[PDB]
Design an enzyme around this catalytic site. Structure first.
Site, PDB file in Angstrom:
ATOM      1  N   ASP A  44       0.846  -1.187   0.000  1.00 35.98           N
ATOM      2  CA  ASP A  44       0.000   0.000   0.000  1.00 35.98           C
ATOM      3  C   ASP A  44       0.876   1.229   0.000  1.00 35.98           C
ATOM      4  O   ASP A  44       1.752   1.347   0.860  1.00 35.98           O
ATOM      5  CB  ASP A  44      -0.910  -0.031   1.235  1.00 35.98           C
ATOM      6  CG  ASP A  44      -1.777   1.226   1.369  1.00 35.98           C
ATOM      7  OD1 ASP A  44      -2.842   1.290   0.779  1.00 35.98           O
ATOM      8  OD2 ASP A  44      -1.439   2.082   2.182  1.00 35.98           O
ATOM      9  N   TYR A  49       3.194  10.072   0.581  1.00 38.97           N
ATOM     10  CA  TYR A  49       4.211   9.459   1.426  1.00 38.97           C
ATOM     11  C   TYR A  49       5.645   9.682   0.954  1.00 38.97           C
ATOM     12  O   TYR A  49       6.586   9.269   1.650  1.00 38.97           O
ATOM     13  CB  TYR A  49       4.006   7.946   1.522  1.00 38.97           C
ATOM     14  CG  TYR A  49       2.627   7.495   1.953  1.00 38.97           C
ATOM     15  CD1 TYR A  49       1.741   8.372   2.561  1.00 38.97           C
ATOM     16  CD2 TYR A  49       2.224   6.153   1.792  1.00 38.97           C
ATOM     17  CE1 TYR A  49       0.481   7.965   2.940  1.00 38.97           C
ATOM     18  CE2 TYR A  49       0.964   5.735   2.194  1.00 38.97           C
ATOM     19  CZ  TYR A  49       0.091   6.657   2.755  1.00 38.97           C
ATOM     20  OH  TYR A  49      -1.175   6.298   3.147  1.00 38.97           O
ATOM     21  N   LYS A  78      -2.728   6.128  -4.228  1.00 40.83           N
ATOM     22  CA  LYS A  78      -3.775   7.012  -3.791  1.00 40.83           C
ATOM     23  C   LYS A  78      -3.482   8.344  -4.438  1.00 40.83           C
ATOM     24  O   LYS A  78      -2.343   8.773  -4.480  1.00 40.83           O
ATOM     25  CB  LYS A  78      -3.839   7.102  -2.236  1.00 40.83           C
ATOM     26  CG  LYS A  78      -3.801   5.673  -1.469  1.00 40.83           C
ATOM     27  CD  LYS A  78      -3.657   5.741   0.089  1.00 40.83           C
ATOM     28  CE  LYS A  78      -3.631   4.299   0.727  1.00 40.83           C
ATOM     29  NZ  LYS A  78      -2.259   3.870   1.178  1.00 40.83           N
ATOM     30  N   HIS A 111      -7.576   9.547  -1.938  1.00 40.23           N
ATOM     31  CA  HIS A 111      -6.952   9.420  -0.611  1.00 40.23           C
ATOM     32  C   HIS A 111      -7.873   9.943   0.503  1.00 40.23           C
ATOM     33  O   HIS A 111      -8.053   9.293   1.528  1.00 40.23           O
ATOM     34  CB  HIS A 111      -5.592  10.139  -0.560  1.00 40.23           C
ATOM     35  CG  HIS A 111      -4.650   9.584   0.472  1.00 40.23           C
ATOM     36  ND1 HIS A 111      -3.282   9.599   0.313  1.00 40.23           N
ATOM     37  CD2 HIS A 111      -4.879   8.964   1.654  1.00 40.23           C
ATOM     38  CE1 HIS A 111      -2.707   9.021   1.356  1.00 40.23           C
ATOM     39  NE2 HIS A 111      -3.655   8.631   2.187  1.00 40.23           N
TER      40      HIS A 111
HETATM   41  N1  LIG Z   1      -5.701   6.018   3.720  1.00 44.99           N
HETATM   42  C1  LIG Z   1      -5.147   6.848   4.610  1.00 44.99           C
HETATM   43  O1  LIG Z   1      -5.487   8.037   4.736  1.00 44.99           O
HETATM   44  C2  LIG Z   1      -4.124   6.201   5.538  1.00 44.99           C
HETATM   45  C3  LIG Z   1      -3.842   6.766   6.764  1.00 44.99           C
HETATM   46  C4  LIG Z   1      -2.940   6.162   7.604  1.00 44.99           C
HETATM   47  C5  LIG Z   1      -2.305   4.961   7.277  1.00 44.99           C
HETATM   48  N2  LIG Z   1      -2.576   4.391   6.045  1.00 44.99           N
HETATM   49  C6  LIG Z   1      -1.927   3.150   5.594  1.00 44.99           C
HETATM   50  O2  LIG Z   1      -1.912   2.071   6.595  1.00 44.99           O
HETATM   51  C7  LIG Z   1      -0.544   1.781   6.851  1.00 44.99           C
HETATM   52  C8  LIG Z   1      -0.431   1.459   8.337  1.00 44.99           C
HETATM   53  O3  LIG Z   1      -0.893   2.511   9.184  1.00 44.99           O
HETATM   54  P1  LIG Z   1       0.161   3.352  10.076  1.00 44.99           P
HETATM   55  O4  LIG Z   1       1.436   3.383   9.345  1.00 44.99           O
HETATM   56  O5  LIG Z   1      -0.511   4.617  10.453  1.00 44.99           O
HETATM   57  O6  LIG Z   1       0.466   2.746  11.444  1.00 44.99           O
HETATM   58  P2  LIG Z   1       0.477   1.207  11.861  1.00 44.99           P
HETATM   59  O7  LIG Z   1       0.678   0.353  10.717  1.00 44.99           O
HETATM   60  O8  LIG Z   1      -0.675   0.923  12.752  1.00 44.99           O
HETATM   61  O9  LIG Z   1       1.792   1.280  12.807  1.00 44.99           O
HETATM   62  C9  LIG Z   1       3.130   1.563  12.403  1.00 44.99           C
HETATM   63  C10 LIG Z   1       4.043   1.572  13.611  1.00 44.99           C
HETATM   64  O10 LIG Z   1       3.955   0.242  14.197  1.00 44.99           O
HETATM   65  C11 LIG Z   1       5.314  -0.240  14.383  1.00 44.99           C
HETATM   66  N3  LIG Z   1       5.251  -1.710  14.280  1.00 44.99           N
HETATM   67  C12 LIG Z   1       4.963  -2.462  13.203  1.00 44.99           C
HETATM   68  N4  LIG Z   1       4.980  -3.784  13.524  1.00 44.99           N
HETATM   69  C13 LIG Z   1       5.290  -3.841  14.820  1.00 44.99           C
HETATM   70  C14 LIG Z   1       5.483  -4.895  15.706  1.00 44.99           C
HETATM   71  N5  LIG Z   1       5.317  -6.145  15.254  1.00 44.99           N
HETATM   72  N6  LIG Z   1       5.807  -4.620  16.988  1.00 44.99           N
HETATM   73  C15 LIG Z   1       5.972  -3.370  17.407  1.00 44.99           C
HETATM   74  N7  LIG Z   1       5.794  -2.335  16.583  1.00 44.99           N
HETATM   75  C16 LIG Z   1       5.466  -2.537  15.293  1.00 44.99           C
HETATM   76  C17 LIG Z   1       6.109   0.345  13.256  1.00 44.99           C
HETATM   77  O11 LIG Z   1       7.490   0.471  13.660  1.00 44.99           O
HETATM   78  P3  LIG Z   1       8.617   0.403  12.493  1.00 44.99           P
HETATM   79  O12 LIG Z   1       8.136   1.055  11.191  1.00 44.99           O
HETATM   80  O13 LIG Z   1       9.846   1.194  13.122  1.00 44.99           O
HETATM   81  O14 LIG Z   1       9.124  -1.088  12.467  1.00 44.99           O
HETATM   82  C18 LIG Z   1       5.492   1.740  13.112  1.00 44.99           C
HETATM   83  O15 LIG Z   1       6.036   2.598  13.954  1.00 44.99           O
HETATM   84  C19 LIG Z   1       0.159   3.097   6.594  1.00 44.99           C
HETATM   85  O16 LIG Z   1       1.560   2.920   6.503  1.00 44.99           O
HETATM   86  C20 LIG Z   1      -0.455   3.450   5.263  1.00 44.99           C
HETATM   87  O17 LIG Z   1       0.026   2.558   4.232  1.00 44.99           O
HETATM   88  C21 LIG Z   1      -3.482   5.027   5.198  1.00 44.99           C
END
Ligand SMILES: NC(=O)c1ccc[n+]([C@@H]2O[C@H](COP(=O)([O-])OP(=O)(O)OC[C@H]3O[C@@H](n4cnc5c(N)ncnc54)[C@H](OP(=O)(O)O)[C@@H]3O)[C@@H](O)[C@H]2O)c1
EC number: 1.1.1.21
Length: 316
Positions: A44, A49, A78, A111
């Site tokens: 994704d 980004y 997006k 997005h």
């Molecule tokens: N459509 C939208 O508007 C929108 C908005 C937000 C997010 N998204 C998408 O969804 C994806 C995920 O959401 P998100 O990035 O907000 O946050 P998330 O995936 O909930 O969390 C990311 C954080 O979790 C940590 N992490 C991952 N696996 C872990 C584990 N097994 N143990 C401990 N910590 C862990 C990562 O650390 P590290 O990276 O240091 O390993 C990072 O800091 C985004 O990257 C993006 O692709 C889309």
């Protein structure tokens, strides 16, 4: 538990994807490569980004190593808010295809439903800290997205952070050519989205859960904010199944027939997050996790609360 979900265009979407928001450019290339080696077939991405080039490098490497074929990967991007103007949409998509080094996208999302003033700034702010909106509406932009499907540039179109009235506007549009295949929305035990999920699934629209771990690396996190990964209730459920809290958090949306896109740039976590097809949360576990809901948003787009198309005034 099928590893893929059938979409309304006929394609199958892998239910586990790698997120890439806040993956720095000098680390996302290795992250994507490890993801593909481990078994991820869904990445994704987004223009906003600022790392699509670097994602592109990684995919290309693995295609040339012949670890995967392109038709095995499902690649999502997006359209950012500053390109909602009808005549800018194709340009935006092509810029993303070019950075990703692909000839097609499997899925291209609007997005956010809010259109911003075109230009160099991702968030063109006014004096007050409010975004300058574009003179655009959701329906015209959707029409431009449909042209991308007709040209073969994207296999599916979709939306992200749309409320059910907004999704309904698209579904009821005069001369609709394509229904959105996906609504990508924030979803985790503190924001369980029961009403939006029920609506979307009833319309044949697949839901992708983002920020499934509570986006612990989000730049605006405050010390008072709740923390999914540190919740001792969720830890006990993990301990129960000899899994980790993150593994429970990823598995949870899967058993709700959702797609989930956890993000990591740490190889060991990328691998850990993949190991979620070897256990099952109980009904009791699911009801418990669903009860933690507290209408808490990571991404509340607070600079756009005056924008005519702000998604989150409505209940769902
Ligand atoms: N459509 C939208 O508007 C929108 C908005 C937000 C997010 N998204 C998408 O969804 C994806 C995920 O959401 P998100 O990035 O907000 O946050 P998330 O995936 O909930 O969390 C990311 C954080 O979790 C940590 N992490 C991952 N696996 C872990 C584990 N097994 N143990 C401990 N910590 C862990 C990562 O650390 P590290 O990276 O240091 O390993 C990072 O800091 C985004 O990257 C993006 O692709 C889309």
């Amino acid at each position: 538990m099928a590893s893929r979900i059938l979409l309304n265009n006929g394609a199958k979407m892998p239910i586990l994807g790698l997120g890439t928001w806040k993956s720095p450019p000098g680390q996302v290339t290795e992250a994507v490569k490890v993801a593909i080696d481990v078994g991820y077939r869904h990445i994704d991405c987004a223009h906003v980004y600022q790392n699509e080039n670097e994602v592109g490098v990684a995919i290309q490497e693995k295609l040339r190593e012949q670890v995967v074929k392109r038709e095995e990967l499902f690649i999502v991007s997006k359209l950012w808010c500053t390109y909602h103007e009808k005549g800018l949409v194709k340009g935006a998509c092509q810029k993303t295809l070019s950075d990703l080094k692909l000839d097609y996208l499997d899925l291209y999302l609007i997005h956010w439903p809010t259109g911003f003033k075109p230009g160099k700034e991702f968030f063109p702010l006014d004096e007050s800290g409010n975004v300058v909106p574009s003179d655009t509406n959701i329906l015209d932009t959707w029409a431009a997205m449909e042209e991308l499907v007709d040209e073969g540039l994207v296999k599916a179109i979709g939306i992200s952070n749309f409320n059910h009235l907004q999704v309904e506007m698209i579904l009821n549009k005069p001369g609709l050519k394509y229904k959105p295949a996906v609504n990508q929305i924030e979803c985790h035990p503190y924001l369980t989205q029961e009403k939006l999920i029920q609506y979307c699934q009833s319309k044949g629209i697949v839901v992708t859960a983002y920020s499934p771990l509570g986006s612990p690396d989000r730049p605006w996190a405050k010390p008072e904010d709740p923390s999914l990964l540190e919740d001792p209730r969720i830890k006990a459920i993990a301990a129960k199944h000899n899994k980790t809290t993150a593994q429970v958090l990823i598995r949870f949306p899967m058993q709700r027939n959702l797609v989930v896109i956890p993000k990591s740039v740490t190889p060991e976590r990328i691998a850990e997050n993949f190991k979620v097809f070897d256990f099952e949360l109980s009904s009791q576990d699911m009801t418990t996790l669903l009860s933690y809901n507290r209408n808490w948003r990571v991404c509340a787009l607070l600079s756009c609360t005056s924008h005519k198309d702000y998604p989150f005034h409505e209940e769902f």
